[PDB]
């Protein structure tokens, strides 16, 4: 797998991003803008993985609790229904995890400094610190986080991590499995899109990734998966 084809996938999408990969504590960089791997961006919709872990661990919820939609007009129309913590993970429904963050509370949430995620600061507003700061995390710190979650090595209960892991399955073909969570901080300039997860190769081998790239409103949501899937195809991970 050349480190140069990576460039022309990103050259052709007219973007500026990096694809971090980790295979058992050996990290390789892959992008047309490799410097972004050590650059702090807001975590956006990816924080839902740590929000679910902190909630399920502290028993502020469970994998079964159904969240009632109480009428208000939400961003996308697929969010306007009752759903559980898992279905809200797939749809990235923000209002659900906000109510969970209020159950946890700012004091208990500021667990974040114990896990050592990003700059480890959440400010005062407990329901929008991952969307416009003051929380920022580097794509290297992200790929290390999901690497521990896949190997079931995060500082939480073993049953809690495996529950969050089951909420993150995206594609299961050819004995492979690809877990991950998407993000898109559309409210900051320049915009930034995420796609952090891992690959469960058929032999159980684990390869974690953390795709970071600048976003624009005109891009499709399937521009992140398209860019990643053709890169794991090239690196012979799938
Ligand atoms: C998390 O970034 C937001 C949540 N996640 C998310 C995504 O990354 O897919 C969408 S934003 C993105 C999805 N399509 C675009 C759109 O608004 N439509 C075409 C409907 C933008 C979603 C908002 C969380 C902060 O809401």
From Swiss-Prot:
The active site is at residue 45. The modification N6-carboxylysine is found at residue 48. A beta-lactam binds at residues 45, 48, 92, 182, 184, 224. Carboxylated on the epsilon-amino group of a lysine, with the resulting carbamate functional group serving as a general base. Probably N-carboxylated at Lys-48 at neutral pH in vivo and undergoes complete N-decarboxylation, at pH 4.1, in vitro. Keywords: Antibiotic resistance, Hydrolase, Periplasm, Plasmid, Signal. It is found in: Periplasm. It catalyses: a beta-lactam + H2O = a substituted beta-amino acid. It comes from the Bacteria. Its EC number is 3.5.2.6. The keyword Hydrolase applies. GO terms for biological process: cell wall organization; response to antibiotic. NCBIfam families: bla_class_D_main (NF012161), blaOXA-23_like (NF000266). Belongs to the class-D beta-lactamase family. PANTHER family: BETA-LACTAMASE YBXI-RELATED, PEPTIDOGLYCAN D,D-TRANSPEPTIDASE. This is Beta-lactamase OXA-23. It comes from Acinetobacter baumannii. The gene is OXA-23.
């Amino acid at each position: 797998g050349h480190n140069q084809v990576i460039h022309q996938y990103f050259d052709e999408k007219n973007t500026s991003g990096v694809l971090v990969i980790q295979t058992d504590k050996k990290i390789n960089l892959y992008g047309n803008a490799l410097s972004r791997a050590n650059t702090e961006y807001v975590p956006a919709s990816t924080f839902k993985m740590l929000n679910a872990l902190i909630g399920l661990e502290n028993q502020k919820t469970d994998i079964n609790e159904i969240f009632k939609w109480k009428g208000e007009k939400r961003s996308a129309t697929a969010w306007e229904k009752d759903m559980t913590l898992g279905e809200a993970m797939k749809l990235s429904a923000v209002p659900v995890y906000q109510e969970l963050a209020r159950r946890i509370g700012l004091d208990l949430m500021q667990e974040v400094k114990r896990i050592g995620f990003g700059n480890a600061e959440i400010g005062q507003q407990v329901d929008n610190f991952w969307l416009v700061g003051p929380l920022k995390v580097t794509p290297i710190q992200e790929v290390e986080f999901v690497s521990q979650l896949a190997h079931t090595q995060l500082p939480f209960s073993e049953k809690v991590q495996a529950n969050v892991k089951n909420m993150l399955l995206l594609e299961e073909s050819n004995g492979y499995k690809i877990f991950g969570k998407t993000g898109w901080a559309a409210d900051i300039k320049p915009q930034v899109g995420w796609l952090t997860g891992w690959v469960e190769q058929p032999d159980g081998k684990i390869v974690a990734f953390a795709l970071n790239m600048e976003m624009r409103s005109e891009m499709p949501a399937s521009i992140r998966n398209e860019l990643l899937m053709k890169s794991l195809k090239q690196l012979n991970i799938i």
